[PDB]
């Protein structure tokens with residue numbers, strides 16, 4: 001079939017090093033879907049030369065699905081006619097750098113990339129933001145792209161989701177693939193709330209199976225929330241490969257469909273569950289025909305409302321801090 | 328179907344960081360083949376802790392095919408009942424380190440790993456050596472495993488093969504997937520000889536298509552031979568991801584079959600083309616039912632004989648240098 005143009009930022013970085021090869025292999029859009037890769041990196045010579053090196057490796061894999069591949073240093077050419085965009089590039093937090101400094105640095109990246117997408121990308125481009133702060137960066141881009149549909153801007157909560165999945169399987173001794181209806185609410189941060197109240201394994205309640213809510217509060221939630229730190233403490237570096245996998249899972253499920261299965265996607269709130277409209281928030285959704293749908297009717301108990309309130313408040317703090325860059 | 332046990336050495340290293348996730352995803356043995364991963368690293372705390380970190384990431388990917396995964400610090404437990412083994416771990420060359428020092432350091436690794444495989448692995452295990460010097464390390468392991476069939480010990484020449492494929496496609500402007508009958512002879516080193524004399528594209532001669540043998544000698548051969556250096560000069564680090572891909576290609580084609588297509592595999596010479604028996608050498612082969620077969624009847628012109636003689640001589644120099652460690 002006709003090739004899809006996939007734009008990827010931060011292409012000479014670690015996450016992309018595990019990501020690009022899997023997209024070219026056809027893991028993201030199907031083994032029958034040819035892809036064109038439009039890679040973006042900062043204008044600096046060092047980053048551009050490294051991006052050249054990565055492209056050399058991609059050619060050396062002889063991928064039958066790779067219909068084309070170009071390098072860019074300008075978001076205006078990188079996002080040209082893009083059908084899908086994975087915004088992985090972002091400004092990390094260094095020494096002496098405060099939170100306000102982090103938010104502004106990233107705001108200035110995403111307002112520009114958002115405007116670029118608005119101007120030259122496909123009119124119905126699917127956007128996924130991986131770069132941190134994911135949810136907030138997705139909000140800035142969305143706000144910076146008035147001509148595109150807001151529902152097309154998403155943030156990745158899939159890594160939190162898969163990490164939660166892993167812990168449940170390890171706890172129940174059941175295969176990770178048998179777990180259903182598990183999901184995560186909120187911000188991709190330690191304040192995320194992995195909700196296991198509706199999760200089932202073979203039609204049996206995971207919550208009742210474990211029958212120890214103390215485990216839920218003092219073990220399950222804190223472990224998933226701090227998993228990234230655990231990996232950095234063990235390997236010395238970030239969790240690049242699992243983050244790349246989660247990104248593939250996100251786009252794959254969004255475009256191809258979950259077949260009734262529930263999943264987690266950071267999407268713009270339509271007001272469901274008392275979440276202010278516009279706020280990019282983790283919600284349980286099902287997908288079909290390239291569209292998502294928020295699972296309605298879930299009960300929100302006291303504990304859940306408190307966790308939701310915490311993750312929501314962190315998001316409102318981030319939004320307040322970049323508000324001046326918008327407009 | 329019943330899970331296959333795959334043993335992988337150098338598991339906390341770079342090549343494995345791109346390799347492990349793709350094997351677990353089912354790229355190596357099929358989407359219907361469950362796998363058990365038995366990972367090996369040196370006994371050192373730092374390497375073992377990093378290996379623990381990589382395993383955490385693998386769990387966080389929620390791979391339905393991963394039937395199990397264990398970490399080891401002893402080759403005797405790591406190779407236990409292994410159906411397939413990818414020997415990626417090896418001693419790299421440092422400052423002041425001479426060639427004789429490199430050969431001995433690696434000889435001492437591979438004699439031990441070879442004996443271990445001999446003792447505890449499946450009686451028909453498939454072995455692939457990626458660690459450099461690949462061909463020679465494969466020879467040491469094979470020699471160190473008298474109870475196993477010698478044809479089961481191979482070295483990876485697939486990266487040289489795919490790199491040659493890439494250059495031909497770029498030169499002819501034809502899709503990399505349309506190229507047939509291309510292959511590489513010899514040692515996985517700059518002395519390798521990518522032979523394009525029988526390569527075809529749509530039933531048309533690639534050699535006649537290019538019609539410039541000077542390009543072959545002074546451009547094609549030197550570029551493929553030094554491609555690894557070109558990548559290190561661009562990225563600052565080795566070509567981990569393309570090497571990992573080539574390893575998957577190697578095992579995949581060997582186990583699943585090439586369906587008549589020719590490919591390159593570093594195998595023990597049976598004496599074909601005047602190559603001394605026992606020498607692990609790159610040969611054009613076809614595969615079927617988990618077995619390979621050397622393509623016979625190719626013409627070897629003067630130029631080819633000289634290139635073959637050079638790569639062969641380098642291999643004999645390496646063999647002479649480790650001979651004292653065998654027995």
Ligand SMILES: NC(=O)c1ccc[n+]([C@@H]2O[C@H](COP(=O)([O-])OP(=O)(O)OC[C@H]3O[C@@H](n4cnc5c(N)ncnc54)[C@H](O)[C@@H]3O)[C@@H](O)[C@H]2O)c1
Pocket residue numbers: 009010011012013014015016040041042047088089090091092109129130131132133134156157159160188238239240243
């Ligand atoms: N959402 C999640 O689940 C999740 C998880 C882990 C990490 N992350 C985030 O993903 C992002 C990338 O992580 P990484 O480990 O690959 O980092 P990295 O530093 O290895 O790579 C980032 C790359 O982005 C590039 N870049 C910087 N500014 C850019 C710009 N404005 N345009 C295009 N490219 C740009 C950099 O030059 C760099 O090569 C980070 O912000 C990281 O914290 C997200």
Ligand SMILES: NC(=O)c1ccc[n+]([C@@H]2O[C@H](COP(=O)([O-])OP(=O)(O)OC[C@H]3O[C@@H](n4cnc5c(N)ncnc54)[C@H](O)[C@@H]3O)[C@@H](O)[C@H]2O)c1
Pocket residue numbers: 336337338339340341342343367368369374415416417418419436456457458459460461483484486487515565566567570
């Ligand atoms: N054959 C090819 O096509 C090809 C191409 C490129 C590189 N290589 C080679 O592959 C090997 C690995 O490369 P890398 O970039 O992943 O290196 P790396 O240094 O990142 O990783 C090697 C890993 O092997 C481990 N190791 C060392 N000794 C070991 C042992 N005796 N048993 C088990 N594990 C051991 C190390 O601790 C390290 O974690 C090297 O020898 C490299 O030069 C082969």
